[PDB]
């Protein structure tokens with residue numbers, strides 16, 4: 001059975017603060033659709049070669065997908081300390097996989113301003129690697145309590161990109177797919 | 193959490209909230225300046241009023257942090273900018289009247305027209321009607337009419353408004369812990385917090401006046417030479433020892449003496465480095481001019497213009513079907529958006545100006561990584577200096593020839609290079625006494641040293657003493673000749689043009705030394721020089737995070753402005769001037785006037 005990589009050609013990608021993960025079990029993998037394509041803006045791999053991956057086997061593959069700003073794609077890498085990496089999506093230092101991103105300004109940015117894609121600006125303590133937070137609790141920045149209401153030193157933790165087609169390249173919406181390769185002890189994704 | 197910790201997360205919430213609202217306000221104002229309609233003039237205010245309402249909301253929210261409790265100067269810098277009560281410290285009826293007179297003054301200046309008493313059906317406004325007269329006319333009475341009409345028609349309309357404009361703006365500054373409105377304007381150069389680099393608002397007055405006296409030898413000798421040439425153009429009108437009539441200086445106010453080149457050229461026999469016809473013979477358009485300017489900044493190590501720049505900028509007038517504001521501007525809308533608004537014609541002046549405006553964008557592109565409140569020049573005079581050093585290198589004959597605009601057989605004699613320096617002196621050094629005398633008058637008016645019974649009297653006393661210029665007809669206190677200038681009636685500071693003139697030659701002297709240039713400073717081109725590019729890029733990316741005393745020191749190595757580089761630029765011209773003025777009186781008499 002063919003692996004369902006056609007996560008990439010999904011219609012709607014999730015916000016980076018609430019990214020989604022799909023498990024890829026027993027199936028034959030089609031890695032050749034990737035390394036013969038200049039459709040991506042990054043295509044950066046870690047721990048594994050981009051072409052030696054064809055004849056490799058993993059226990060299972062996990063496809064993380066989300067949307068981040070153009071200048072925030074650099075934070076989708078092991079050992080990054082930005083707002084996205086610390087508060088939205090953290091990669092482990094021993095990350096073994098490939099991050100892919102392609103410009104989607106025409107479909108994720110409207111002239112009125114697409115505010116659906118959000119990110120977390122404030123969070124107590126950085127995120128563990130591969131952790132995920134969806135809580136919209138009013139972040140308390142001071143020492144007096146926030147009673148579920150916003151005001152001074154009580155800000156909403158989620159901030160939304162104002163994606164618009166006239167922005168610079170560094171502020172245009174980029175859809176990201178972080179393919180991670182797991183290896184435990186048991187045999188399922190191959191291509192010898 | 194510490195007060196500094198609470199202020200950092202506050203600025204983080206502000207920077208992301210302000211950048212989105214500022215972009216909608218900037219793009220809305222772009223759609224108006226490029227497409228003057230009724231929907232866009234209201235969208236500019238709708239998006240503009242929401243930004244001002246958001247700013248006042250964030251003003252008081254920022255005042256909850258005691259400025260002395262913050263130790264990180266970067267956040268301490270941003271807090272003081274937000275906590276500025278600004279013009280909102282006035283009551284509603286005073287703030288609404290101040291915004292009214294500021295709009296009314298800006299209206300009767302831009303829409304003020306005078307009519308020819310000889311041909312009443314031909315009426316003309318400042319641009320382009322009245323400005324064309326002051327720029328090209330050689331008739332004394334014709335220049336006298338346009339000069340006096342502009343100050344008697346629209347100048348008197350601004351007199352009662354400017355009196356209320358001063359008293360309302362003074363109360364705004366005294367409430368924000370300043371002496372007067374002039375003290376408020378001089379705060380742009382103030383540096384407080386950095387050890388060894390502090391700088392007070394009174395140090396500006398001391399530094400510009402001490403350096404202005406070092407410029408008097410060059411300006412007086414040019415004034416004597418220009419007076420001698422102007423005597424030949426207006427015989428029996430100019431005393432060889434008196435001041436110059438204000439209407440014979442080349443424009444409406446005498447701010448720049450550039451249009452006097454046709455009367456003051458040292459060697460008119462030499463070929464004119466005007467490549468306007470040469471640009472047409474090569475079938476150039478506005479795209480070719482800006483694409484060539486893009487090629488200039490890349491050769492020194494700077495990047496191309498952004499992809500959105502070539503998509504969104506307005507490099508030509510979109511025709512008569514869609515009227516726009518044709519004032520050359522460089523727009524920094526944030527969010528990676530960089531545009532230039534300029535109705536470019538196929539001429540040489542628009543070619544050099546295209547490098548100035550693109551220089552502003554290179555400055556805007558560099559500090560884009562800084563936080564929102566720090567994305568600006570070091571002081572008000574840094575942007576204008578960065579833009580001029582681009583046109584300075586792009587105006588040298590060797591650069592103009594190597595582009596393809598001038599023939600490769602142009603002999604650069606000591607006569608063609610003295611004609612070039614004289615043209616540069618009429619603009620660069622001619623405006624220095626005009627700028628100081630204007631700001632010195634505005635400084636005294638806000639300090640109350642010049643009462644209303646001698647507003648115009650003390651104005652023209654300083655015109656004779658400081659600038660060496662006399663009014664052609666006497667003006668009482670009904671006139672308001674300073675307000676007949678744009679920057680005065682539109683609430684713009686003017687000392688920024690004095691400092692940028694000195695900064696641009698400190699910048700030029702530093703980069704040309706790194707550019708391995710050997711000849712005179714006025715023959716330098718920093719093209720192909722990545723050494724000078726990286727040296728300058730260390731300054732533009734700094735923005736306003738570091739004080740201007742450091743930013744200026746980072747490139748040239750000085751905590752303050754210096755008049756020496758300016759004098760070195762015109763030193764070959766200075767000696768030629770002293771040779772001409774041996775049998776001519778150097779200086780002016782403050783008592784001569786073209787009437788009795």
Ligand SMILES: *[C@@H]1O[C@H](CO)[C@@H](O[C@@H]2O[C@H](CO)[C@@H](O[C@@H]3O[C@H](CO)[C@@H](O)[C@H](O)[C@@H]3O)[C@H](O)[C@H]2NC(C)=O)[C@H](O)[C@H]1NC(C)=O
Nearest residue numbers: 079080081082083200201263264265266267268561562563
């Ligand atoms: C005053 O506050 C500012 C802002 O909080 C401080 O600047 C920040 O300094 C930290 C390091 O202490 C920078 O973190 C670095 O971020 C880069 C991002 O590429 C990362 O690669 C590094 O590994 C490091 O984590 C942070 O970026 C920087 N912020 C800005 C806007 O530049 C400043 O240090 C404070 N002043 C003092 C004296 O501490």
Ligand SMILES: *[C@@H]1O[C@H](CO)[C@@H](O[C@@H]2O[C@H](CO)[C@@H](O[C@@H]3O[C@H](CO)[C@@H](O)[C@H](O)[C@@H]3O)[C@H](O)[C@H]2NC(C)=O)[C@H](O)[C@H]1NC(C)=O
Nearest residue numbers: 490491492590591592593594595596600717718719720721
């Ligand atoms: C340093 O800056 C100078 C200033 O423009 C550059 O000189 C000009 O460079 C262009 C192309 O790099 C030359 O165009 C060529 O012209 C010849 C004319 O025979 C033509 O046959 C070629 O096909 C091409 O179009 C231009 O002539 C040249 N200027 C002069 C006066 O020779 C120079 O290239 C810069 N150095 C670099 C970029 O390394």
Ligand SMILES: *[C@@H]1O[C@H](CO)[C@@H](O[C@@H]2O[C@H](CO)[C@@H](O)[C@H](O)[C@H]2NC(C)=O)[C@H](O)[C@H]1NC(C)=O
Nearest residue numbers: 223224226227228229230231232233235510514
């Ligand atoms: C000039 O401004 C108008 C709005 O003031 C722009 O938009 C037009 O708006 C009307 C009103 O909804 C629409 O019916 C038109 O279809 C819009 N477009 C045009 C071309 O009229 C207009 O686009 C602006 N002009 C340019 C050249 O950008």
Ligand SMILES: *[C@@H]1O[C@H](CO)[C@@H](O)[C@H](O)[C@H]1NC(C)=O
Nearest residue numbers: 004005006007008009033037
């Ligand atoms: C997505 O669709 C395009 C064409 O519609 C195709 O070229 C591409 O390979 C597809 N991607 C995947 C991962 O199947």
Ligand SMILES: *[C@@H]1O[C@H](CO)[C@@H](O)[C@H](O)[C@H]1NC(C)=O
Nearest residue numbers: 255275276277280281367368
């Ligand atoms: C601004 O004005 C308000 C009252 O109008 C005052 O309480 C506040 O202290 C002022 N803030 C500053 C920084 O001057």
Ligand SMILES: *[C@@H]1O[C@H](CO)[C@@H](O)[C@H](O)[C@H]1NC(C)=O
Nearest residue numbers: 486490491493494495496497
């Ligand atoms: C700038 O754009 C031109 C377009 O042809 C390209 O050739 C050049 O390499 C670009 N340079 C930089 C620094 O982006």
Ligand SMILES: [Cl-]
Nearest residue numbers: 438445673674
């Ligand atoms: Cl005047």
Ligand SMILES: [Zn+2]
Nearest residue numbers: 548552576579
């Ligand atoms: Zn400019």
